[PDB]
Write a protein that binds this ligand. Structure first.
Ligand SMILES: [Ca+2]
Length: 240
C-alpha cells in the first residue's frame, strides 16, 4: 500500500497473509480475506504459480512475533473457472482456498462480512485498502499491515478514456487514483473494506494497478467486485 498508515492491530481481523515456501522460510506474496473458519477469498492470479502456500491469520508484523498469529496450510485451491492468467483485464480474478484446519476466532481473527449480491457502491464511497504490499512503486513490502483511504470511482468514470477505458469491467470496483495512495505489489488478493449502513464489508479483492506504477493519477487500484461473485462463492463452499 503506497501512502498508507499503519493499521491498528484489531481493525481488520479478516485480513490474511498468503505466503509461499521459499527455501527454509516463507515469503508473503498476497493478501486474502478470511470468509469461513476454513476458507479464504483471494485473487486467482495470486495462486497461478505451482507453489506451496500457507495462510497466516492474526498477523500484524510480517517480521516479528505478534503473539496472535495462527499458521495453516492450504488444502484445496478453487480458481474461478473463467480466469485466464494472460488476461487480468477480462476479470474473474478470484479464488477460494480451503484451509487444512479451521482457525480460531478472536479479536485478531474474524470472518469478513461480504456484500449482498449485485450491490454497487455510489461514486466516491468511503473504503480502505489494507495489506503488506510495496509501500512505493518498485519499493519493498511493508513490515506492519497498512491501510489507505481509497474512495470508489464508479464504472462510468473508471471506464472513461483518461481512466482505465475498456480495461475496467463492471465486474470490478475501482478505488483511489489520487496519485498518492494506492495498492501495490503484494496487496493483491486482499480486501477493499467499504463502509455501508454503518458496517464495513469487503467489496473488493485487490487485482491490478497500472504497468506505469502503483500510485498513478486516474489509474485507481482495481479490485474484483465481490458482489458479482456471491453465488459462485456460495456454490464453491457448498460443494467443497
Ligand atoms: Ca508477525
Amino acid at each position: 500500500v503506497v501512502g498508507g498508515t499503519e493499521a491498528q492491530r484489531n481493525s481488520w481481523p479478516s485480513q490474511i497473509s498468503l505466503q509461499y515456501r521459499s527455501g527454509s522460510s516463507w515469503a508473503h506474496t498476497c493478501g486474502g480475506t478470511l470468509i469461513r473458519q476454513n476458507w479464504v477469498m483471494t485473487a486467482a492470479h495470486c495462486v497461478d504459480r505451482e507453489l506451496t502456500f500457507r495462510v497466516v491469520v492474526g498477523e500484524h508484523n510480517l517480521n516479528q512475533n505478534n503473539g496472535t498469529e495462527q499458521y495453516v496450510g492450504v488444502q484445496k485451491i478453487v480458481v474461478h473457472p473463467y480466469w485466464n492468467t494472460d488476461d487480468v483485464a477480462a476479470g474473474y480474478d478470484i479464488a477460494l482456498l480451503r484451509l487444512a484446519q479451521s482457525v480460531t476466532l478472536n479479536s485478531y481473527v474474524q470472518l469478513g462480512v461480504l456484500p449482498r449480491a449485485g450491490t454497487i457502491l455510489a461514486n466516491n464511497s468511503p473504503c480502505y485498502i489494507t495489506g503488506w504490499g510495496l509501500t512505493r512503486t518498485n519499493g519493498q513490502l511493508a513490515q506492519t499491515l497498512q491501510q489507505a483511504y481509497l474512495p470508489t470511482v464508479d464504472y462510468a468514470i473508471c471506464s472513461s478514456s483518461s481512466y482505465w477505458g475498456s480495461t475496467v469491467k463492471n465486474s470490478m470496483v475501482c478505488a483511489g487514483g489520487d496519485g498518492v495512495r494506492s495498492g501495490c505489489q503484494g496487496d493483491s488478493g486482499g480486501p477493499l473494506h467499504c463502509l455501508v449502513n454503518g458496517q464495513y464489508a469487503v467489496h473488493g479483492v485487490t487485482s491490478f494497478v497500472s504497468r506505469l506504477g502503483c500510485n498513478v493519477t486516474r489509474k485507481p487500484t482495481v479490485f474484483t467486485r465481490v458482489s458479482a461473485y456471491i453465488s459462485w462463492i456460495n456454490n464453491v463452499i457448498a460443494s467443497n
